[model samples]
Target: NSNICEVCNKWGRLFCCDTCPRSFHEHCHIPSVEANKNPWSCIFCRIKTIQERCPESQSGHQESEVLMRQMLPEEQLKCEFLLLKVYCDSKSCFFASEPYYNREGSQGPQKPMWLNKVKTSLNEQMYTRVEGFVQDMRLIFHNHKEFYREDKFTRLGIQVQDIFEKNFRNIFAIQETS
Candidate 1:
């Protein structure tokens, strides 16, 4: 039977307190068995101590916490809002005009200024879906004012559901071939 500390590479006859079956050298104990007479810690305790002292441990814990937060429903909703804002801004007139399509049909000439105008038009069209819903809500508020007198919030909630369903279907519906 060879008694050796796998961690410190020291050879001696010693028994680990945590796992009595395993053996370790005197120097490999938590406090180096020879130094502490009462009771010496095992390799497991020393490893746990090293892990706690490690600088990267805190960072790894923080990263996992952030990942957990991102997996939450509320966090996902916020992420969707952020994506929507970014998509809306990227497709805006200012950003869209920088594309290479505007430089076409130019020979020893400068970039076309009409590119921005075209982008503006396209951006407005893309934004029309949300704007159309707003207009519909406005119309409902003005015309059906009497019906919504009891509960305006409920009416607005119902209206939002219909608009959201229509928009979602229009954006995500897959085309089928006969």
Candidate 2:
């Protein structure tokens, strides 16, 4: 046997397996060899197959599938607080919607009541901490509307990912100590 391949020591080009930490030469494993066009399976594939076929994997997979099915795009976005849906049709629309007592029984402008409450809470507490960051983001939209239109949503997604990664790392770091 010729020790040529980086993984299995079979004389041929390096063919790394995607599923496991194994490598094999084409000619050594098979009689005639052509280009390695197809995806390679490895030891991990066997483990995964066994796990998937087993009752334990079935239960775990079922739970994960249910969790995945329950999560919606809107729910994920709301969790990050990155997307705010403001329902202002005109300049005075927000103020007009405010609930105030008047002499005449005139109804306020139609707006989402929850949004008004959220706005009040955010202004009172959250905006002070993140106002500058929010302003910077808004400036990007104002200056480059086209780029913002194309990539603003994706940028916000990345920000959410970054926040998740940071928090996850922090959580795990604490957990690993004890």
Candidate 3:
């Protein structure tokens, strides 16, 4: 039983996913979910199910990147799912929240990026292309690496960056071009 919903990190009556530690308020989940159903699984878990059920043929299709505003419903789903996976990682999920301090003429990160800001960008269709979305995702980690030195925060940043990269490759079925 989780005390706080992962998305908002707030205490409330939350819906716990049977397969994972994440909890969610009805409105906090992507597409919003209800707790009335037993064995409720979060979207992340559901994506896992889809992958596992057809591991061999799930993602080898070559697809060209398109504008965020012009994305098909399926492409949008993939992007949202990738972001949710990043949020599920508690060790580094604080990057989801925007930092409050100002960085003008300061030693702060040159580019400030956070998950919620990226989420808002996606919601508002601000990114011109899918690669833009990927760039922003990496920018969050890049800023962390630039700001934090050798410490737990830096280590956790690396770990979460790895997590994001791996999930992004799988969710999008990205094939590297030489």
Candidate 4:
């Protein structure tokens, strides 16, 4: 792993994630890294625990794409867990900001959606199907990239999206379809 924190991108006495090349300062890590915990894994690596504990939702009789049609109760729970994982991985909290900056741009009106708003929608049952939840999650990143396409912060959003999608497959047990 690099000598710098993956989250902050600065040199520090960082803790390296056992499962991936990412490293982080103790406080920079989500949930804050603990000294007492040994052989620690990052949130992306530890996502398997969620699947192990909530196996009931992992065996849905649908492909990853099909789950988007309608969310079963168990499927909804899995989606919530995946959202929580994304929120946890976003220790920098960059994607949670409102995207209403500089109203003049080539892009049309984007109804800004942030991480917290997704949670609020989830809590209020605004999403009738898994597609809605997934759409909102992607929108958060879409909004970020649409505004700041070539910045370090936008890079972080991309990483978060990658991790979220990987874990989304794992938690939902979404298998490949021919």
Candidate 5:
């Protein structure tokens, strides 16, 4: 029920029927069903007997319960953009965690996949609204020490959201009609 895949007889990456013990693989439980889409009730839980009908009870119902998933594109952008600042090391990038013995130095500070994705997606573009968005981005890191005096995690709630939203304007800008 929990660890077993009802379809493949293997264990890993499963879709849980919110109503019952029957778990399934994403590909197994109909591949197109994205995990977050609500009303995801499996058939066995939905219908007990041939004569019995199932209620329209949605999974976790009405946003009272929701699964936070990592691949969410919008949330991914908000968090990932923070890493573009130079010296994105350790907690920000996984390669930094690898020991000096094992970590590949020639690779030169291998970036997090999310950062690579944002860079590749953006390409080299000088923005039209032009708030020096293309100018040396490493300056974003110059103030981290003072702002994070008490603890590095202190500014987690404050600067991340508002400043990110401020930068979001740079990501999606239109040229002023001069």
Candidate 6:
């Protein structure tokens, strides 16, 4: 009978929620909610709440949600970091929600389950086979690099990727309660 920080696996002070099983590092919860609040609800719970009530069922979420629920912090963060990479693939913020497979490959499902459940049909197994969305972002970024400047590799682009590679682990550790 024990609980753990959802982000860092280290044994440390953590805040638990009264409404759900979700736990967060004092600083890991975004916007910093009052951990002391009686019957406190975590952000995921809050979002889950909306999804369940607003004509949406939690079951609509892809298996990724299940994967996310079980994924370790390192794994989850890989998705986030890869998210940033694909996120930077271009200025189009809309890509996160659009289908990457193609416009007419008719068959399977699409939509960003990590973002939200939508009315879409895609090969559910694709989500399961991918270790995390991190790999998806990497593949997509590589295929779609023409949208950005040509200096993504070699001398054209090397340092920031290096800096990111070296420092990304601690980026999530920046918390308020430390």
- Candidate 3 at 157: error in angstroms? 1.2
lDDT of 5 at 25: 70
TM-score for candidate 1, residues paired by index? 0.20
How do the residues 1-178 of candidate 4 rate in per-residue lDDT, one tens digit apiece?
Answer: 7787765678878899877887878755644576776778875566556566666746744544645567655565666667766755645277665556663453633678887677667667788888888888887777777776565666876888897887777776676455
TM-score winner between 1 and 4, please give it.
4
lDDT by residue for model 5 over 1-178, one digit each (tens)? 4786664457888777776787777644422235585757653443332114323321122211111223243323322233232112223332112222222323222322232333433333322222222222222222332334566553542443344434433322212232
Every candidate's lDDT: 0.35, 0.34, 0.74, 0.69, 0.37, 0.40
Write down the RMSD of all candidates, one decimal each. Answer: 26.4, 22.1, 5.0, 7.2, 18.4, 15.2
Task: Give the TM-scores of the predictions, in the order they appear.
Answer: 0.20, 0.20, 0.66, 0.59, 0.26, 0.33
Query: Which stretches of candidate 1 lie above 4 Å from their native place?
Result: 1-3, 8-12, 19-21, 28-31, 34-39, 49-58, 61-178
Clashing residue pair totals per candidate (backbone < 3 A): 0, 0, 0, 0, 0, 6
lDDT (Cα, tens digit) per residue for candidate 6, span 15-49: 78777775667654442448367878765565445
- lDDT score, candidate 3: 0.74
Task: Report how far off residue 155 is in candidate 2 (Å).
Answer: 66
| Model 2 worst lDDT run, 10 consecutive residues | 83-92
lDDT of 2 by residue, 1-178 (tens): 2235422344557456666565556522221123564666533344355546653533322222232332243222222233221221122132223333232433332332322343444434443323322333333323332223454443543443344334323311222222
lDDT of 3 by residue, 104-135 (tens): 44367767989888888877867656777888
Cα shift from native, residue 6, model 4 (Å): 19
Worst 10 residues of 4 by lDDT: 101-110
Candidate 6: give the clashing pairs.
108-121, 108-122, 108-123, 109-121, 109-122, 109-123
Ranking under lDDT, best-scoring first?
Answer: 3, 4, 6, 5, 1, 2
Two-way lDDT contest, 1 vs 4, winner: 4
Q: Give the TM-score of candidate 2.
A: 0.20
| Tens digits of per-residue lDDT for model 1, 1-178 | 2355543345667655553444556433322355554465453444345446664533322222333342233233222222222222222222223323322332321322222332233334432333332233233323332333454433543453354334333322213223
lDDT of 2 at 177: 29
Error of 1 at 120 (Å): 73
